[PDB]
Design a protein around this ligand. Structure first.
Ligand SMILES: Nc1nc2c(ncn2[C@@H]2O[C@H](COP(=O)(O)OP(=O)(O)OP(=O)(O)O)[C@@H](O)[C@H]2O)c(=O)[nH]1
Ligand SMILES: Nc1nc2c(ncn2[C@@H]2O[C@H](COP(=O)(O)OP(=O)(O)OP(=O)(O)O)[C@@H](O)[C@H]2O)c(=O)[nH]1
Ligand SMILES: Nc1nc2c(ncn2[C@@H]2O[C@H](COP(=O)(O)OP(=O)(O)O)[C@@H](O)[C@H]2O)c(=O)[nH]1
Lengths: 62, 60, 426, 430, 170, 43, 411
C-alpha cells in the first residue's frame, strides 16, 4: 500500500513538469507579444506626431 | 504521512493548473488586442497618405 | 454486495442460529437440501449477503458454529436445515468450560479461538465489502460468555472499522439457571463496554411473558423462543436484502441511535405478535402496529422503559405502507407521552420502511429503543456480584485459574461508572 | 439551450424517476428510448445514432440498492449505464462520512462524467441539482460537488432544488448537524436555491389532492410538475418567455439571499375538475395563499422582495397583467418598500400533461409561482434552536470528529449561519 | 514570536551556505545520495537499507533524482514554517544538525536555542525530545539527535481523535 | 525583570537562567530593530 | 498491392487465428492483397499448429504453409536462436521467397511475435535478420508483445526481452508495442469483460491490424499506404516504437446509447486509459501522431478534432514538430465477427503515435533484468545453449544508449 501511494505522488510531480514547462513557453510568447505592443504603439504615435506637423505647416503656409 | 503528502502535492498541482488556464486567457485576449490595434495603425497610416497627398496638391 | 458473517457461540448461540438459518432460507426460497426454488427475481438478487453459491445451485450459509461440547453440534446436523452448513465451519473443542468464565476466557479459550479465527478470517476474505459481524451468545454461561467475549475482543483488534452486533440474553434473578450468573454477567459486560460496537440486551423473563400473554402458548419449548428471536434478527437486516422507500443499513442505525460511545445497549420489541384466537379479529394498520410496538409488556427485555426516559428509538417497518403514516405515528406517540422522551434531543425516533414483509404476514415491524431504564439490570446484577465477592465465595476456580483480585475490583468500578454515567445522561 | 440535471442520494434519484417518466411521456418517447424539426426534446435528450434519445442526467449515490432498481426497471434502455453512478457503502446519515470519508473518492468520477455531458452540450444554460440536506449523501458530497462545480465553471447557473428537514415531520435524528454543515456551503456555492419542505407537500396532498395516505411517489410527481413548468420556457415557444438566467438577476437582491418559496396551482383532483372552471383570475389568487406553498412557513410574517410567475396553457397577457395589478393593490400581502414592482410574469403555450396513474387532473392552464421573502429567516432561527439544543452537550459529535472533523467547523459554521440571520434581518429593516 | 525567527534566519543564512558546500564532496551544487552516507559517517551514525532513498525522495518535488540548492532552500523554508503542516522532515534534521554544529561532535545546550526558536515550550517539553537536564551537560552525537527527532514526529503523528475525544461533562 | 529574579546570577547551582538569557537576547535585537526603524523613520 | 503476413510462436499464430478469421469474413479484386492465404504459421512445438490443421480452416490454408518443428524452444532465446532455430528458419524463408515470387507489387512483410518466449524472441529475430539481407528495402511491420511490469507468466522474460529488442532496433522498420496487462485493463474497463482470456485480446488486435491495412484493400477519401507510416512517424532511424490505440472499444449495450462522432473518438484515442501499452504518455512529449479513420467521416471534423487536441494542455507536443499529425480516411466501415464482443460502429479510429513514454518502459525493464544478471542467475541455461557471458552485458549497454537517446531528443 505504501508503494501504491508512492507511485500516485510521483505521478502528480511528473504531471507538474509539463505544466510548468508550458507555462514558461507561454511567458516567453506573451513577452514577445507585449514587447511588440510597445513597439507598434510608438510607431503609431510617430505617425500621429508627424500628422499634426504636416497640418500645421500647410495651414501656416496659406 | 504519505496520505497527507499526496494531498499537499495535489493542491500544488491544481494551483499550477488554474494558473495555466489563466495564462491561456492572457495569451488569447492579447492576440485580439494586436488585431484591433494594428487596425488603428492602418487608419492613422491611411490618414497620412491622404494627408501628404493634399499638401503637394496645394503646393503646386 | 455488503456481507455479514454469522458467529454462534455455546449452546444458546447454536440453537438460536439454527432456527435463524431456517427462517432466513424460507424467506429466500432455499429448500433444506440447499438448492434454489424461488420464483421472484427479488429473492435471487440479494443472497450474497448471507450465502455463497457453491456448485450447481448449492447455496451454503455464511455461518460459523463454535462451542465446547459435541452435543450441540450433533443436535444441529440432526435437525432439518442441518445439512446446509459447510462441515469445515464447525470449529469445535472437546473438554468444556463448566460455566467457569475463566475456563472460557483463559484456560480453554487459548486453544480454540485461534482455530475459530481462521474460519472467521476465511469468511471475511471470502466476501468483498464487509458490512459487519453478527454474534449470538449468552451472558450467564461459560462457553458462550467467555469464548464469545475473547473472540469479540480479538476481532475488533483485527477489523476495527467494521460494524458488529452481539445478540445476547442476560440472566435475571427470577430465571436463575446457573449459580455463578453474576460473576459471568459483570465480567462479560465489562468486556462488551469497550469492545462491541452495539449490543442488544435480551433476557429470558421477557421471552416467557411474551409466550404467556401475547402468544398465549401452552407448552413454549425453546423452539418458540428461538423462533421469536430469529424474527427480530431478520428484521434488523431486511434493509440490506430488499429495496424500499426508506432504507436503513446497520451503520445508519448505529450512528443515529448511539449518542455517546459507551451507551450502546438496546431494548428490542417486535410486531405483530398475535395469538391464534385473535389473528383473525385484528386489522393491519400502521397505528395498530405502533401501539403494539411501543407497548411496555411487548419489550423483549425485562426492563420497563416507563421507569425511565427514552434517549433514542428506532423503527424498522416491513411491507407496502405509506410513509406519511410512518412519520405521523412517530410524531404522535412522542407528543402525548412527552415526559418519557429525553428533552435535549428533538425527534428522538428514527424510522425506516422496507417493501418486503415476512412470509405469511401482510405487514410487520421491529423496534429498537435505546432507553435509560437499562441501568436497573446493571444494578440488579452488580449488587449480587458485590454480595458474593465480599466473602470470596466461588472464587478459587477464578483466582486459581488466572484471575486476581484487581480484575473483580476493575469489573465493579467499570460497572459503577457506567450506571453513574447512565444516571447523568438521563 | 441545454441543461443537465443531476440527482444526489436516495431522495434525489427518486425525484428523478418521476421527472424522466413525465418528460418522455410529454415528447411521445417510448420507455425503450425510440420515437415510434420537433427539437423541443433536445434540451434534455441528445439524439444518438438514428431514432434514439438519451437523457442529459446522471444519478449518483453511495448506496447500491436505490440506483439498482432503476437499472432493472422499465427504463433499462432509456439511460446509458455509465450515467447511473453507485458506491460501495453508504454515508449513513453522517455528513462527515459523506464529505470526508466516502465522498472524497466518488466525486472525482462524478465530475469526469459531468465533464463530457457539458462537452456534448453547446449553449449550456446551467445545471440543476436534486438533494435533501437532511441525509448524508445529499448533504456531504452534495456540498462537495457544488464546491468543485464552482471552481470548474463558476459563471454558469447552478439551480439547486433542496429539501430541508421539516420541523416536526422527520425521519432522522442528526439531521440538524447535516443541515447546518451543508448550508454553510449552500450559501456561497449555489447561485439559485429553492427550498422544499416535506410537511408542506404532505399537507397539500391531504387537503387538495384528497389522498389521505400519500407515499413518496405522489410527492415526486408534483415536484416534476414544478420543474417541468420552469423548463417549459426552454422547450416550447410562448407569448412571454423567461429563461434560467432571469432568476439570477430578478430574484436575488443580495449575493447571500437566494432562497425561494415555490408554489403550484391548480392542484385539483379529477372529479372537482369537472365542477370548477380554472381561469386565470382565480389561479393567480391561488398562487399566493399559504395553503398551496411548497415550504411549511408563513410569508405573512415577512415582506416580499420579488416574485416570478410561470403561466402555462391558453393565457393571454391581458388578463394576467390585470390580475397582477389586483394582487398588488390588495393589503393582505405586502411588499418591501424599496422595490416598487415585485413581480416578473411569464406565459407559455403548452398546457401541463397528465401521466397515467398520476393524481393530477387534466387542466386548461396552470401557474407555478417562485417568490422570495423573509419568512425564510424564521426557518433558520427555528433550526438554530434545536441544533444548539443538542450541541450544548456535544451530543453525536463523536461520530463526526472520529470521521475527520474537529471543533472549529461546528463553532465557525454555527456562527456563520448566525451572521446569515443578521443579513435577512437587516435587509427587512427600513 | 516572529522576531526570534526573523533574527535567526538573518544569521543562519551565511552558516547554511557553507553547510551546503561542506555536505557536498564533489565540489558541485548537487547533493547525491552518496554524499549523505559520508555525512552520516562524519556524524557517526549509520543509515538503514532504504533510508537514503526515502531521504532523497521526500525532499525533492520539482524534479526527480539528485537534489539542488534551490530545492534545499525551498525545503528549509517550508519545514521551518511547517509547524502545523504534518509534513516530512527527514533531511531537514541532518542539515539543521550540521548548521547547529560548531564543535564537530554535536551540540549540548544549543538544543534550547533550537527549542526556543521553534517555541518557548517548557522544561518538561525539553524532557520529551531528550533527557538533557538544566545543570548537567552531556556528550552528544549525530546518533542521538536524529533518532529522537524522528521518533517524536512519529509519536505526534499517531495520536488522533476517534473515541479518544472528551466532551465537557453534563 | 531579569535582575529581579530569585536565582543568584553568580551561582551555577541553578542553571535555569539559561532560558532567561535567551529571552533577553530576543528583546535586545527587538530594541536594535526598533532603533533602526526610528533612524529610518526620522529622515 | 499485396502484403504477406508471417506468424511466429504460440502467441503469433493464435493472433493469426483471429486475423485470418476476420479477413475471410470481411471479403466474404479487393481481396487480391490477401488472397489460399498469403501466410506462413511457424512454430517449434507442433501442438498449436495441429490445432489449425484439425480446425475448421483445414481447407483454407495450403498444407505446406503451416510450418511446425519437432521440439520446443524451452523459453530460451538461446535455444530458439542457435540450437533449434537453425533447422526451421531455412525452410521458413525458402517458402516466403516463392510466396513473394507469386506477388508482383509487394508492399512489405508484417510479423507477429511475443518477445517473452523462446521462439517469438529467438527465431523471430533470426528470421528478421535474414529477411533484411534478402530484401532490405521492403517494409517489415513488427507487432511485438513486450512483457508487462506487474503481470507476468514467466520468470526469465527480462532476459529474452532485452536480448530480442537489441536486434529489433536495426531489423524492423516499424515496431508497435502491445502489452498484455494494458489490454486486460482495457477489456475490463470499456468492454466490461471481468474474466477475459487470450481469445478476446487476439480478437481486438486483429481489429487494429485490419484498420491500418484497410487503405490498401478499399478506396478511401484520403488513402494512406504502408510507406506513409515509414516516413511520417519515424523522425530518426533509431526511434521506431509506437503506441497504439483504437476507438471505440465499446460493448453492445453502451454503444447504442452513445453518440459516436469524430471529435469524441479522437479525444478517446488520446487518453492513457485506452492505449494498448501500459505507459503514461503524459509523462512524455509527443513527436508525431497518425490517425486512421474508417467509415462515415468527412475531412472537416477530423481536422476540427485535431485542432482541439493541439490547443489542449493536458498533453504537450515536441518543439521540433509543430505539424505533428498524419490523418487518413477510408470509406469501408469496420466489420464484426459473430461471437465477437464488439458491436457494429459507423466509424472507428486507430491511432499510432510516437512519444517518450516508451523511453520510460525500457528503463523499467532494464532494472529487473539488471538485478538478476549481476549475480548470474539463470545465465547458465543460455550459455549451455550456445551463448556466452559477453552478449548479456553488451545488450545491456545497447538499451542504455537507447535511454540516453530518448532523454536527449525530448529536450
Ligand atoms: N420528497 C421526497 N423526499 C424523500 C424521498 N425519499 C427520501 N426523502 C427524504 O430524504 C431524507 C433522508 O435522506 P435520504 O434521501 O432518504 O437518504 P440520503 O440523503 O441518500 O442519505 P443516506 O441515507 O446516508 O444515503 C428524509 O428526510 C426524507 O424526507 C422522496 O421520495 N421524496
Ligand atoms: N496477446 C496474446 N499473447 C499471448 C498469447 N499466448 C501467449 N501470449 C504471450 O506470450 C508470452 C509468452 O511467450 P510465448 O508466446 O508463450 O512463447 P512462444 O512463442 O510459445 O515460444 P515457446 O513457448 O518457447 O515455444 C507472454 O507475454 C504471453 O502473455 C495469446 O494468445 N495472445
Ligand atoms: N432462548 C434460549 N435460551 C437458552 C436455550 N438454552 C439455554 N438457554 C439460556 O442459556 C442460559 C444458560 O446458558 P448456557 O446454555 O449454559 O450457555 P453456554 O454453556 O455458554 O452455551 C440460560 O439462562 C438459558 O436461559 C435455548 O434453547 N433457547
Amino acid at each position: 500500500h505504501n508503494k501504491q501511494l508512492r507511485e500516485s505522488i510521483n505521478n502528480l510531480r511528473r504531471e507538474r513538469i509539463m505544466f510548468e514547462s508550458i507555462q514558461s513557453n507561454l511567458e516567453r510568447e506573451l513577452a514577445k507579444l507585449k514587447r511588440d505592443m510597445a513597439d507598434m504603439i510608438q510607431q503609431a504615435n510617430g505617425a500621429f506626431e508627424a500628422r499634426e506637423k504636416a497640418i500645421g505647416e500647410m495651414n501656416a503656409l496659406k | 504521512l504519505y496520505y497527507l503528502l499526496g494531498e499537499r502535492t495535489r493542491r500544488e498541482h491544481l494551483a499550477m493548473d488554474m494558473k495555466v488556464r489563466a495564462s491561456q486567457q492572457l495569451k488569447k485576449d492579447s492576440a485580439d488586442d494586436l488585431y484591433t490595434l494594428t487596425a488603428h495603425f492602418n487608419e492613422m497610416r491611411a490618414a497620412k497618405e491622404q494627408a501628404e497627398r493634399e499638401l503637394a496638391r496645394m503646393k503646386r | 454486495m455488503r456481507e455479514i458473517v454469522h458467529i454462534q457461540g455455546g449452546q444458546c448461540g447454536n440453537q438460536i442460529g439454527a432456527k435463524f438459518w431456517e427462517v432466513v432460507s424460507d424467506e429466500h426460497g432455499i429448500d433444506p437440501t440447499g438448492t434454489y426454488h424461488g420464483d421472484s427475481d427479488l429473492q435471487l438478487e440479494r443472497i450474497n449477503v448471507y450465502f455463497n453459491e457453491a456448485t450447481g445451485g448449492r447455496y451454503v450459509p455464511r455461518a460459523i458454529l463454535m462451542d465446547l461440547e459435541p452435543g450441540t453440534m450433533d443436535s444441529v446436523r440432526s435437525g432439518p436445515y442441518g445439512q446446509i452448513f459447510r462441515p469445515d465451519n464447525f470449529v469445535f473443542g472437546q473438554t468444556g468450560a463448566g460455566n467457569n468464565w475463566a475456563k472460557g476466557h483463559y484456560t480453554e479459550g487459548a486453544e480454540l479461538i485461534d482455530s475459530v479465527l481462521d474460519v472467521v478470517r476465511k469468511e471475511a476474505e471470502s466476501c468483498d465489502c464487509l458490512q459487519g459481524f453478527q454474534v449470538c451468545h449468552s451472558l450467564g454461561g461459560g462457553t458462550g460468555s467467555g469464548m464469545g467475549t475473547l473472540l469479540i475482543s480479538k476481532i475488533r483488534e483485527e477489523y476495527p472499522d467494521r460494524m458488529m452486533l452481539t445478540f445476547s440474553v442476560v440472566p435475571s434473578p427470577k430465571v436463575s439457571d446457573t449459580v455463578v450468573e453474576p460473576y459471568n454477567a459483570t465480567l462479560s459486560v465489562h468486556q462488551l463496554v469497550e469492545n462491541a460496537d452495539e449490543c442488544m440486551v435480551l433476557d429470558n423473563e421477557a421471552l416467557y411473558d411474551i409466550c404467556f400473554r401475547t402468544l398465549k402458548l401452552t407448552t413454549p419449548t425453546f423452539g418458540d423462543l428461538n423462533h421469536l428471536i430469529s424474527a427480530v434478527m431478520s428484521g434488523i437486516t431486511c434493509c440490506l436484502r430488499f429495496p424500499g422507500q426508506l432504507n436503513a443499513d446497520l451503520r445508519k442505525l448505529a450512528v443515529n441511535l448511539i449518542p455517546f460511545p459507551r451507551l450502546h445497549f438496546f431494548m428490542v420489541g417486535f410486531t405483530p405478535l398475535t395469538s391464534r384466537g385473535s389473528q383473525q379479529y385484528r386489522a393491519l394498520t400502521v397505528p395498530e402496529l405502533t401501539q403494539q410496538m411501543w407497548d411496555a409488556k411487548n419489550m423483549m427485555c425485562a426492563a420497563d422503559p416507563r421507569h425511565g426516559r427514552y434517549l433514542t428509538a428506532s423503527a424498522l417497518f416491513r411491507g407496502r405502507m405509506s410513509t406519511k403514516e410512518v412519520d405521523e405515528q412517530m410524531l404522535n406517540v412522542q407528543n402525548k407521552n412527552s415526559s418519557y422522551f429525553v428533552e435535549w434531543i428533538p425527534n428522538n425516533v428514527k424510522s425506516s420502511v422496507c417493501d418486503i414483509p415476512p412470509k405469511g404476514l401482510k405487514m410487520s415491524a421491529t423496534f429498537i429503543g435505546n432507553s435509560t431504564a437499562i441501568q436497573e439490570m446493571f444494578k440488579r446484577v452488580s449488587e449480587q456480584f458485590t454480595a458474593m465477592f465480599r466473602r470470596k465465595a466461588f472464587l478459587h476456580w477464578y483466582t486459581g485459574e488466572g484471575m486476581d483480585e484487581m480484575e473483580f475490583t476493575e469489573a465493579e468500578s467499570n460497572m459503577n461508572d457506567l450506571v453513574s454515567e447512565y444516571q447523568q445522561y438521563q | 439551450r441545454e441543461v443537465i440535471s443531476i440527482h444526489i442520494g436516495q431522495a434525489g434519484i427518486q425525484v428523478g424517476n418521476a421527472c424522466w417518466e413525465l418528460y418522455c411521456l410529454e415528447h411521445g418517447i417510448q420507455p425503450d428510448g425510440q420515437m415510434p424539426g420537433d427539437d423541443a426534446f433536445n434540451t434534455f435528450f441528445s439524439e444518438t445514432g438514428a431514432g434514439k434519445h438519451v437523457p442529459r442526467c446522471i444519478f449518483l449515490d453511495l448506496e447500491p440498492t436505490v440506483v439498482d432498481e432503476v437499472r432493472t426497471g422499465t427504463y433499462r434502455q432509456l439511460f446509458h449505464p455509465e450515467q447511473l453512478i453507485s458506491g460501495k457503502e453508504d454515508a449513513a446519515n453522517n455528513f462527515a462520512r459523506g464529505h470526508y470519508t466516502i465522498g472524497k473518492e466518488i466525486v472525482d468520477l462524478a465530475l469526469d462524467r459531468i465533464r463530457k455531458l457539458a462537452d456534448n452540450c453547446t449553449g449550456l444554460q446551467g445545471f440543476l441539482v436534486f438533494n435533501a440536506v437532511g441525509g448524508g449523501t445529499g448533504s456531504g458530497l452534495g456540498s462537495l460537488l457544488l464546491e468543485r462545480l464552482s471552481v470548474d465553471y463558476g459563471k454558469k447557473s447552478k439551480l439547486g432544488f433542496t429539501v430541508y428537514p421539516s420541523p416536526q415531520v422527520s425521519t432522522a435524528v442528526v439531521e440538524p448537524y447535516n443541515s447546518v454543515l451543508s448550508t454553510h456551503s449552500l450559501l456561497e456555492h449555489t447561485d439559485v436555491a429553492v427550498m422544499l419542505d416535506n410537511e408542506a407537500i404532505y399537507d397539500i396532498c391531504r387537503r387538495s389532492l384528497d389522498i389521505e395516505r400519500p407515499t413518496y411517489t405522489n410527492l415526486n410527481r408534483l415536484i416534476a410538475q414544478v420543474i417541468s413548468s420552469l423548463t417549459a420556457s426552454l422547450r416550447f415557444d410562448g407569448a412571454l418567455n423567461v429563461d434560467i438566467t432571469e432568476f439570477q438577476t430578478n430574484l436575488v437582491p443580495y449575493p447571500r439571499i437566494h432562497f425561494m418559496l415555490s408554489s403550484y396551482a391548480p392542484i385539483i383532483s379529477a372529479e372537482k375538475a369537472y365542477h370548477e372552471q380554472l381561469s386565470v383570475a382565480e389561479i393567480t389568487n391561488a398562487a399566493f395563499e399559504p395553503a398551496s406553498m411548497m415550504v411549511k412557513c408563513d410569508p405573512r410574517h415577512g415582506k416580499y422582495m420579488a416574485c416570478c410567475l410561470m403561466y402555462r396553457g391558453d393565457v393571454v397577457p391581458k388578463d394576467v397583467n390585470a390580475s397582477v395589478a389586483t394582487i398588488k393593490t390588495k393589503r393582505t400581502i405586502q411588499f418591501v418598500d424599496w422595490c416598487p414592482t415585485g413581480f416578473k410574469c411569464g406565459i407559455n403555450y403548452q398546457p401541463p400533461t397528465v401521466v397515467p396513474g398520476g393524481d393530477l387532473a387534466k387542466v386548461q392552464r396552470a401557474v407555478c409561482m417562485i417568490s422570495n421573502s423573509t419568512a425564510i429567516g424564521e426557518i433558520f432561527s427555528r433550526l438554530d434552536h434545536k441544533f444548539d439544543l443538542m450541541y450544548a452537550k456535544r451530543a453525536f459529535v463523536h461520530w463526526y470528529v472520529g470521521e475527520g472533523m474537529e471543533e472549529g467547523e461546528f463553532s465557525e459554521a454555527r456562527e456563520d449561519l448566525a451572521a446569515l440571520e443578521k443579513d435577512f434581518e437587516e435587509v427587512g429593516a427600513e | 514570536a516572529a522576531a526570534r525567527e526573523r533574527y535567526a534566519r538573518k544569521n543562519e543564512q551565511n552558516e547554511l551556505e557553507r553547510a551546503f558546500n561542506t555536505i557536498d564532496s564533489k565540489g558541485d551544487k548537487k547533493i547525491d545520495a552518496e554524499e549523505l552516507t559520508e555525512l552520516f559517517l562524519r556524524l557517526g551514525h549509520k543509515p538503514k537499507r532504504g533510508e537514503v532513498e526515502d531521504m532523497i525522495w521526500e525532499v525533492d518535488e520539482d524534479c526527480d533524482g539528485c537534489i539542488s540548492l534551490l530545492e534545499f532552500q525551498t525545503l528549509y523554508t517550508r519545514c521551518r514554517d511547517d509547524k502545523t503542516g504534518y509534513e516530512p522532515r527527514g533531511l531537514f534534521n541532518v542539515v539543521e544538525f550540521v548548521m547547529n554544529d560548531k564543535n564537530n561532535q554535536g551540540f549540548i545546550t544549543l538544543e534550547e536555542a533550537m527549542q526556543i526558536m521553534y517555541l518557548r515550550y517548557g522544561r518538561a517539553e525539553l524532557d520529551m525530545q531528550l533527557e538533557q537536564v538544566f545543570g548537567t551537560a552531556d556528550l552528544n552525537s549525530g546518533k542521538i539527535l536524529t533518532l529522537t527527532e524522528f521518533l517524536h514526529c512519529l509519536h505526534t503523528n499517531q495520536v488522533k481523535q476517534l473515541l479518544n475525544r472528551v466532551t465537557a461533562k453534563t | 525583570d531579569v535582575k529581579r529574579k530569585p536565582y543568584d546570577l553568580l551561582d551555577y547551582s541553578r542553571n535555569a537562567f539559561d532560558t532567561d538569557f535567551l529571552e533577553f537576547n530576543v528583546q535586545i535585537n527587538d530594541l536594535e530593530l526598533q532603533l533602526q526603524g526610528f533612524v529610518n523613520a526620522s529622515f
